[PDB]
Design a protein around this ligand. Sequence first.
Ligand SMILES: [K+]
Ligand SMILES: [Mg+2]
Ligand SMILES: [Mg+2]
Ligand SMILES: [Mg+2]
Ligand SMILES: [Mg+2]
Ligand SMILES: [Mg+2]
Ligand SMILES: [Mg+2]
Ligand SMILES: [Mg+2]
Ligand SMILES: [Mg+2]
Ligand SMILES: [Mg+2]
Ligand SMILES: [Mg+2]
Ligand SMILES: [Mg+2]
Ligand SMILES: [Mg+2]
Ligand SMILES: [Mg+2]
Ligand SMILES: [Mg+2]
Ligand SMILES: [Mg+2]
Ligand SMILES: [Mg+2]
Ligand SMILES: [Mg+2]
Ligand SMILES: [Mg+2]
Ligand SMILES: [Mg+2]
Ligand SMILES: [Mg+2]
Ligand SMILES: [Mg+2]
Ligand SMILES: [Mg+2]
Ligand SMILES: [Mg+2]
Ligand SMILES: [Mg+2]
Ligand SMILES: [Mg+2]
Ligand SMILES: [Mg+2]
Ligand SMILES: [Mg+2]
Ligand SMILES: [Mg+2]
Ligand SMILES: [Mg+2]
Ligand SMILES: [Mg+2]
Ligand SMILES: [Mg+2]
Ligand SMILES: [Mg+2]
Ligand SMILES: [Mg+2]
Ligand SMILES: [Mg+2]
Ligand SMILES: [Mg+2]
Ligand SMILES: [Mg+2]
Ligand SMILES: [Mg+2]
Ligand SMILES: [Mg+2]
Ligand SMILES: [Mg+2]
Ligand SMILES: [Mg+2]
Ligand SMILES: [Mg+2]
Ligand SMILES: [Mg+2]
Ligand SMILES: [Mg+2]
Ligand SMILES: [Mg+2]
Ligand SMILES: [Mg+2]
Ligand SMILES: [Mg+2]
Ligand SMILES: [Mg+2]
Ligand SMILES: [Mg+2]
Ligand SMILES: [Mg+2]
Ligand SMILES: [Mg+2]
Ligand SMILES: [Mg+2]
Ligand SMILES: [Mg+2]
Ligand SMILES: [Mg+2]
Ligand SMILES: [Mg+2]
Ligand SMILES: [Mg+2]
Ligand SMILES: [Mg+2]
Ligand SMILES: [Mg+2]
Ligand SMILES: [Mg+2]
Ligand SMILES: [Mg+2]
Ligand SMILES: [Mg+2]
Ligand SMILES: [Mg+2]
Ligand SMILES: [Mg+2]
Ligand SMILES: [Mg+2]
Ligand SMILES: [Mg+2]
Ligand SMILES: [Mg+2]
Ligand SMILES: [Mg+2]
Ligand SMILES: [Mg+2]
Ligand SMILES: [Mg+2]
Ligand SMILES: [Mg+2]
Ligand SMILES: [Mg+2]
Ligand SMILES: [Mg+2]
Ligand SMILES: [Mg+2]
Ligand SMILES: [Mg+2]
Ligand SMILES: [Mg+2]
Ligand SMILES: [Mg+2]
Ligand SMILES: [Mg+2]
Ligand SMILES: [Mg+2]
Ligand SMILES: [Mg+2]
Ligand SMILES: [Mg+2]
Ligand SMILES: [Mg+2]
Ligand SMILES: [Mg+2]
Ligand SMILES: [Mg+2]
Ligand SMILES: [Mg+2]
Ligand SMILES: [Mg+2]
Ligand SMILES: [Mg+2]
Ligand SMILES: [Mg+2]
Ligand SMILES: [Mg+2]
Ligand SMILES: [Mg+2]
Ligand SMILES: [Mg+2]
Ligand SMILES: [Mg+2]
Ligand SMILES: [Mg+2]
Ligand SMILES: [Mg+2]
Ligand SMILES: [Mg+2]
Ligand SMILES: [Mg+2]
Ligand SMILES: [Mg+2]
Ligand SMILES: [Mg+2]
Ligand SMILES: [Mg+2]
Ligand SMILES: [Mg+2]
Ligand SMILES: [Mg+2]
Ligand SMILES: [Mg+2]
Ligand SMILES: [Mg+2]
Ligand SMILES: [Mg+2]
Ligand SMILES: [Mg+2]
Ligand SMILES: [Mg+2]
Ligand SMILES: [Mg+2]
Ligand SMILES: [Mg+2]
Ligand SMILES: [Mg+2]
Ligand SMILES: [Mg+2]
Ligand SMILES: [Mg+2]
Ligand SMILES: [Mg+2]
Ligand SMILES: [Mg+2]
Ligand SMILES: [Mg+2]
Ligand SMILES: [Mg+2]
Ligand SMILES: [Mg+2]
Ligand SMILES: [Mg+2]
Ligand SMILES: [Mg+2]
Ligand SMILES: [Mg+2]
Ligand SMILES: [Mg+2]
Ligand SMILES: [Mg+2]
Ligand SMILES: [Mg+2]
Ligand SMILES: [Mg+2]
Ligand SMILES: [Mg+2]
Ligand SMILES: [Mg+2]
Ligand SMILES: [Mg+2]
Ligand SMILES: [Mg+2]
Ligand SMILES: [Mg+2]
Ligand SMILES: [Mg+2]
Lengths: 177, 116, 66, 75, 51, 136
Amino acid sequence: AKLHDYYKDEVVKKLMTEFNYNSVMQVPRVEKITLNMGVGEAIADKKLLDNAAADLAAISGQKPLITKARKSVAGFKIRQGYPIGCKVTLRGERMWEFFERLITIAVPRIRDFRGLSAKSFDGRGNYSMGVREQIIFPEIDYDKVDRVRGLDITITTTAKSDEEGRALLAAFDFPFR
Amino acid sequence: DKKSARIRRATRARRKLQELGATRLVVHRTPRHIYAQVIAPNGSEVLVAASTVEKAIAEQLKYTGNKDAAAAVGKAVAERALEKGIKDVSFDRSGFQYHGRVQALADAAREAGLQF
Amino acid sequence: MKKDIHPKYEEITASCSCGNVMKIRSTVGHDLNLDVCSKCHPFFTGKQRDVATGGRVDRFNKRFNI
Amino acid sequence: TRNGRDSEAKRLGVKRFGGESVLAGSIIVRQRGTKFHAGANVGCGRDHTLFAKADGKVKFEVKGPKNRKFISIEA
Amino acid sequence: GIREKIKLVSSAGTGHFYTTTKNKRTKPEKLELKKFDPVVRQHVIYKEAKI
Amino acid sequence: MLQPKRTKFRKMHKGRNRGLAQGTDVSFGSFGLKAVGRGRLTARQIEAARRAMTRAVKRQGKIWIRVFPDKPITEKPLAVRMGKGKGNVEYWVALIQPGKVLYEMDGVPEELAREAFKLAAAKLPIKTTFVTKTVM
RNA sequence: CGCGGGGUGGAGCAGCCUGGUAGCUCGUCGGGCUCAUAACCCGAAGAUCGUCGGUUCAAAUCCGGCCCCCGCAACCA
RNA sequence: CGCGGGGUGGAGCAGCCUGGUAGCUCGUCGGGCUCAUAACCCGAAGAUCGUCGGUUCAAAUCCGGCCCCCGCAACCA
RNA sequence: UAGUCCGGAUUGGAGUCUGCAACUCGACUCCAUGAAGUCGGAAUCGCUAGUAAUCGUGGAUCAGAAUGCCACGGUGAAUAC
RNA sequence: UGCCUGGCGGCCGUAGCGCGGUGGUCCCACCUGACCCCAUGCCGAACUCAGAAGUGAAACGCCGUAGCGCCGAUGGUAGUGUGGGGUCUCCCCAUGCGAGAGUAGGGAACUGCCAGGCAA
RNA sequence: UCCUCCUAAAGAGUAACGGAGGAGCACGAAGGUUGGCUAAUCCUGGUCGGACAUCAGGAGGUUAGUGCAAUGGCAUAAGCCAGCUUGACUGCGAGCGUGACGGCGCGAGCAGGUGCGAAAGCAGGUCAUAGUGAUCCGGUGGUUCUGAAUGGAAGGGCCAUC
RNA sequence: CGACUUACCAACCCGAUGCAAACUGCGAAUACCGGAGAAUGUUAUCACGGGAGACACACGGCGGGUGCUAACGUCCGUC
Ligand SMILES: [K+]
Ligand SMILES: [Mg+2]
Ligand SMILES: [Mg+2]
Ligand SMILES: [Mg+2]
Ligand SMILES: [Mg+2]
Ligand SMILES: [Mg+2]
Ligand SMILES: [Mg+2]
Ligand SMILES: [Mg+2]
Ligand SMILES: [Mg+2]
Ligand SMILES: [Mg+2]
Ligand SMILES: [Mg+2]
Ligand SMILES: [Mg+2]
Ligand SMILES: [Mg+2]
Ligand SMILES: [Mg+2]
Ligand SMILES: [Mg+2]
Ligand SMILES: [Mg+2]
Ligand SMILES: [Mg+2]
Ligand SMILES: [Mg+2]
Ligand SMILES: [Mg+2]
Ligand SMILES: [Mg+2]
Ligand SMILES: [Mg+2]
Ligand SMILES: [Mg+2]
Ligand SMILES: [Mg+2]
Ligand SMILES: [Mg+2]
Ligand SMILES: [Mg+2]
Ligand SMILES: [Mg+2]
Ligand SMILES: [Mg+2]
Ligand SMILES: [Mg+2]
Ligand SMILES: [Mg+2]
Ligand SMILES: [Mg+2]
Ligand SMILES: [Mg+2]
Ligand SMILES: [Mg+2]
Ligand SMILES: [Mg+2]
Ligand SMILES: [Mg+2]
Ligand SMILES: [Mg+2]
Ligand SMILES: [Mg+2]
Ligand SMILES: [Mg+2]
Ligand SMILES: [Mg+2]
Ligand SMILES: [Mg+2]
Ligand SMILES: [Mg+2]
Ligand SMILES: [Mg+2]
Ligand SMILES: [Mg+2]
Ligand SMILES: [Mg+2]
Ligand SMILES: [Mg+2]
Ligand SMILES: [Mg+2]
Ligand SMILES: [Mg+2]
Ligand SMILES: [Mg+2]
Ligand SMILES: [Mg+2]
Ligand SMILES: [Mg+2]
Ligand SMILES: [Mg+2]
Ligand SMILES: [Mg+2]
Ligand SMILES: [Mg+2]
Ligand SMILES: [Mg+2]
Ligand SMILES: [Mg+2]
Ligand SMILES: [Mg+2]
Ligand SMILES: [Mg+2]
Ligand SMILES: [Mg+2]
Ligand SMILES: [Mg+2]
Ligand SMILES: [Mg+2]
Ligand SMILES: [Mg+2]
Ligand SMILES: [Mg+2]
Ligand SMILES: [Mg+2]
Ligand SMILES: [Mg+2]
Ligand SMILES: [Mg+2]
Ligand SMILES: [Mg+2]
Ligand SMILES: [Mg+2]
Ligand SMILES: [Mg+2]
Ligand SMILES: [Mg+2]
Ligand SMILES: [Mg+2]
Ligand SMILES: [Mg+2]
Ligand SMILES: [Mg+2]
Ligand SMILES: [Mg+2]
Ligand SMILES: [Mg+2]
Ligand SMILES: [Mg+2]
Ligand SMILES: [Mg+2]
Ligand SMILES: [Mg+2]
Ligand SMILES: [Mg+2]
Ligand SMILES: [Mg+2]
Ligand SMILES: [Mg+2]
Ligand SMILES: [Mg+2]
Ligand SMILES: [Mg+2]
Ligand SMILES: [Mg+2]
Ligand SMILES: [Mg+2]
Ligand SMILES: [Mg+2]
Ligand SMILES: [Mg+2]
Ligand SMILES: [Mg+2]
Ligand SMILES: [Mg+2]
Ligand SMILES: [Mg+2]
Ligand SMILES: [Mg+2]
Ligand SMILES: [Mg+2]
Ligand SMILES: [Mg+2]
Ligand SMILES: [Mg+2]
Ligand SMILES: [Mg+2]
Ligand SMILES: [Mg+2]
Ligand SMILES: [Mg+2]
Ligand SMILES: [Mg+2]
Ligand SMILES: [Mg+2]
Ligand SMILES: [Mg+2]
Ligand SMILES: [Mg+2]
Ligand SMILES: [Mg+2]
Ligand SMILES: [Mg+2]
Ligand SMILES: [Mg+2]
Ligand SMILES: [Mg+2]
Ligand SMILES: [Mg+2]
Ligand SMILES: [Mg+2]
Ligand SMILES: [Mg+2]
Ligand SMILES: [Mg+2]
Ligand SMILES: [Mg+2]
Ligand SMILES: [Mg+2]
Ligand SMILES: [Mg+2]
Ligand SMILES: [Mg+2]
Ligand SMILES: [Mg+2]
Ligand SMILES: [Mg+2]
Ligand SMILES: [Mg+2]
Ligand SMILES: [Mg+2]
Ligand SMILES: [Mg+2]
Ligand SMILES: [Mg+2]
Ligand SMILES: [Mg+2]
Ligand SMILES: [Mg+2]
Ligand SMILES: [Mg+2]
Ligand SMILES: [Mg+2]
Ligand SMILES: [Mg+2]
Ligand SMILES: [Mg+2]
Ligand SMILES: [Mg+2]
Ligand SMILES: [Mg+2]
Ligand SMILES: [Mg+2]
Ligand SMILES: [Mg+2]
Ligand SMILES: [Mg+2]
């Protein structure tokens, strides 16, 4: 709730002056943070996905959905309705709580973090980070995990352009290159 | 769009109900207010209509958009319907899950005397 | 949220060596200890010190000095 | 030859036409999909066969959003 | 071939039965549907049995 | 030799070459060889008449071929009795109704465009005529 | 249509009628051997009884099914 | 032209008519042994399966055409 | 008892001496770096006592440039029917 | 009476798109909270409940503009029933039926029944 | 033998050693029914992650999907998930369609008794059209039938089924 | 590992053309089914009985499959 109230108390204002918005609803707001973890190696070992889910459930608050394979493909030897990855679609209250914990204490533990890519936008304000390790989040014990399976964070917003959506994140002291 | 998804979710009931040729009680729910109207088997003309938007019912209640308000309309519609001569009808939930306000409206319509 | 199935999402106090005390809510346990934060990490100075590393002609002049 | 096979013909089509008087139960159209649809007082069996549900005269209409052919009966 | 045929026999009542097909290899357990016995004139648990 | 690169069906019915043609107007090029007669042009004839034009006008100029075969013609082997299947596809033809522009030229003189089309027309079975790109 | 026997490491075997202790031979890795190769010899690595159910102090073993494996000789829509 | 069968490391054969796996024996390259070569011993590579298309999540393996290859038939007058 | 406080290759940087000159192409030093390697297939070599094994040491050639060569001594076995 | 907006039908593209402008007193939508009713195969995004701080941003309406889609004559053309004729794997007269395509253009729909607010 | 398309001349039907393809099953949920959903292919962005796994968005508008060939169909979806279940129910059946016939199909409504839904209702197998064989002769269970003097019985019959 | 040149070869959309038995956003003439009504016809209709023959067809015109838009060919629809 801290970043949530920060948005309303500050930021709501800061963005109004930049793009001379007519109304307060025109300002981009952050909709959902979708944590994906396409484990993939679960074809060989079935438990390996259950280990990844335990890690996502630790990293986020809520428990992840086990995503099925959409179509069968020969390139990786998978079939229709096979559990291939994990996801969490966290939004609302716990979203802002996670979003604080991400930027404020998780990003800084990225190995040799110099600057995050400002050109990593979808052409519609929706940002996508990809973390290499789990260890960067302080929820994982060091002697528990035995495999470097990263996730990828995807911040979805209401902006109609990446330039409009950059300022939104940048206004939360987001480390860009 | 949400509306369009609610319309096509309802359509099956509507089209099945107009084929039978029955007098349907349409109930349009809204964040503020709940509506209800008994429509003739042809589908065009309305026989009875009531809602929390009507001041006669709005003046009485605490707030227009809740279970106790839905019961007040559900009573009202059925109270008029019996005066008109209507009794045997159907209940078009109109793409709204039969659970809260519409269930209260329906239960009030049953308890008022409208036998359906 | 659906109760029972999720893990215990309890409040905890983050306290780094810098001095920034900070309450948060996460699935850890009792307390926390951090190295760095959004404040106190060298990215504002890091990019200043990292980019200005090159310099070959002055390095030669520092040896010869004439 | 390689081929030379064929199925028996299924006698599918509009049996009773528009304006024709029919008795309750009379099949109006035998067909595969719903090329014609069931309107007023007309059924639609498992075979998609459109049959009269009441004694009257058959009426073909072209009504709906997608502009489909409906078969109705009017007494 | 493959899919054999079975005799669903009534529990409570006369030895009236239904007959259906069944894949025995994929589904090794037995059926226990609740079908209508017309001698008793009642819905009854019909258990699977052989011919 | 012109032929469809892959087809839905290998063998087609005989059909009937009736009515008038549709590609009547000289669309792309300046001049054109119109079919007065009715018939069918084999793949060989088209190539043979194309070579006769192309070589008459030299490297200069540009040629269009408005007709394309896409109709397989079957033929039964020698000393084979009737029936026992439809015959094997030997050659490919384009059905030509009256009015059909077969070929069109561009970027050449009028007097030397005619001399080229005579040589082409000599290869074809159908009776042909010269036509110019008029307005409307 | 049957009554009958028969069912183990990868496989061919017995052992299975006389309930408390699953053998035995080819596939198995290390030796000893010899200036060496073959052999020959020694020891190791693997099934709690195809599998599920009753009783009784103890059940591959007594008794019922399955998946079956058949021996056959019967088999006339 | 009809009819079966084929076409897979350099050679000859399996795997092919039960769709996801490429073996065997020679030969080749590397190292040993010998005075040297052979034989012998120890390692290694080497085939996208006639070709072009389909079907399929995926084709050496299913299906169709086309190019060689064997075997069989082309009979009565 | 770990690819380890084993190995110390390989590289980046900073140097030192010799020498007209050290990039092709020296040696050594410091700092960081921290590879293959877990006792070696068929084969196969030396060695019968201060010998084998193993530790250092010196010299020749040599401005500089030994893990080679030539010498020197430490500890010091097994086995030979 | 008009002006509004909802609900519900008739009509199914002259009724749909793109485009430009606008509406927020109500109405409607986003919205605000989630102890609860109930909800996610994770998530109050849905569905649901409680509300009224903001807003008309998006949605939805609504008015404009032919950039598209669609509608679309007349004359001709092609087919073609009947009867005749040819130079007869094709055509032609006589007589009736007469497209498709494409033009000239029309075109930003039109209306029912309740129900609420607003200038009268 | 059977189903689908054309040949087939805009009702039905329509031949050839005409042109192309399929079937001889599957399924206790892949049936019933209530509640929800909406698809291919892209283009972006994103840890390994590649030409292609998973996520996020957009553009698309059924280009997909439908247990199996093809045709006709499917958004109210007949497609895709989900919760309860046995209507894949017994006795009938107005009336139709299609057959030379043997047959084959469709069917509202009725009686009994059920599932589902708050009900309106829906449900007598599955998007539809292939998945199949007559009789005879025997086998199995049932039965308000017969029972060669009389009681039984055997054997018949009738039901269900092989 | 940093990257330049280019006698150059064809995508999906644009505009313009063709073609299709197994393509259809369109679409006739006819033919077919039903109803209404004159007139005309030796009831021409349909129903049930008694007797049959026939179930090798030919050519001609129109629509076509097949053959070579060969056949006094062959196979269907229609007169
Ligand atoms: K006939
Ligand atoms: Mg539904
Ligand atoms: Mg009011
Ligand atoms: Mg035939
Ligand atoms: Mg057919
Ligand atoms: Mg036939
Ligand atoms: Mg037949
Ligand atoms: Mg039915
Ligand atoms: Mg019961
Ligand atoms: Mg034809
Ligand atoms: Mg034409
Ligand atoms: Mg034209
Ligand atoms: Mg032949
Ligand atoms: Mg015996
Ligand atoms: Mg020796
Ligand atoms: Mg027999
Ligand atoms: Mg091999
Ligand atoms: Mg060699
Ligand atoms: Mg080769
Ligand atoms: Mg495919
Ligand atoms: Mg393969
Ligand atoms: Mg240890
Ligand atoms: Mg390593
Ligand atoms: Mg170390
Ligand atoms: Mg290693
Ligand atoms: Mg190693
Ligand atoms: Mg050693
Ligand atoms: Mg050895
Ligand atoms: Mg040493
Ligand atoms: Mg030394
Ligand atoms: Mg010296
Ligand atoms: Mg030394
Ligand atoms: Mg509109
Ligand atoms: Mg607009
Ligand atoms: Mg706009
Ligand atoms: Mg404004
Ligand atoms: Mg505006
Ligand atoms: Mg008010
Ligand atoms: Mg919210
Ligand atoms: Mg809400
Ligand atoms: Mg707006
Ligand atoms: Mg805007
Ligand atoms: Mg107006
Ligand atoms: Mg205008
Ligand atoms: Mg204009
Ligand atoms: Mg204008
Ligand atoms: Mg006019
Ligand atoms: Mg005539
Ligand atoms: Mg004529
Ligand atoms: Mg005349
Ligand atoms: Mg004359
Ligand atoms: Mg003549
Ligand atoms: Mg006209
Ligand atoms: Mg027109
Ligand atoms: Mg037009
Ligand atoms: Mg114009
Ligand atoms: Mg104009
Ligand atoms: Mg308007
Ligand atoms: Mg008007
Ligand atoms: Mg009025
Ligand atoms: Mg036809
Ligand atoms: Mg027909
Ligand atoms: Mg016809
Ligand atoms: Mg015939
Ligand atoms: Mg076949
Ligand atoms: Mg079956
Ligand atoms: Mg289920
Ligand atoms: Mg269903
Ligand atoms: Mg769009
Ligand atoms: Mg499709
Ligand atoms: Mg298909
Ligand atoms: Mg269904
Ligand atoms: Mg469905
Ligand atoms: Mg229940
Ligand atoms: Mg049950
Ligand atoms: Mg139950
Ligand atoms: Mg059945
Ligand atoms: Mg059937
Ligand atoms: Mg009764
Ligand atoms: Mg009843
Ligand atoms: Mg019940
Ligand atoms: Mg109930
Ligand atoms: Mg009921
Ligand atoms: Mg149904
Ligand atoms: Mg189904
Ligand atoms: Mg089916
Ligand atoms: Mg079927
Ligand atoms: Mg017989
Ligand atoms: Mg008998
Ligand atoms: Mg017996
Ligand atoms: Mg008895
Ligand atoms: Mg009786
Ligand atoms: Mg008796
Ligand atoms: Mg008796
Ligand atoms: Mg008796
Ligand atoms: Mg007697
Ligand atoms: Mg007596
Ligand atoms: Mg007796
Ligand atoms: Mg007695
Ligand atoms: Mg008997
Ligand atoms: Mg009997
Ligand atoms: Mg009886
Ligand atoms: Mg080109
Ligand atoms: Mg175009
Ligand atoms: Mg056709
Ligand atoms: Mg056609
Ligand atoms: Mg058009
Ligand atoms: Mg149409
Ligand atoms: Mg007309
Ligand atoms: Mg007429
Ligand atoms: Mg008539
Ligand atoms: Mg009549
Ligand atoms: Mg009449
Ligand atoms: Mg009459
Ligand atoms: Mg009269
Ligand atoms: Mg009479
Ligand atoms: Mg009569
Ligand atoms: Mg008659
Ligand atoms: Mg007679
Ligand atoms: Mg005969
Ligand atoms: Mg005959
Ligand atoms: Mg005769
Ligand atoms: Mg004939
Ligand atoms: Mg003839
Ligand atoms: Mg003819
Ligand atoms: Mg002829
Ligand atoms: Mg003659
Ligand atoms: Mg003849």
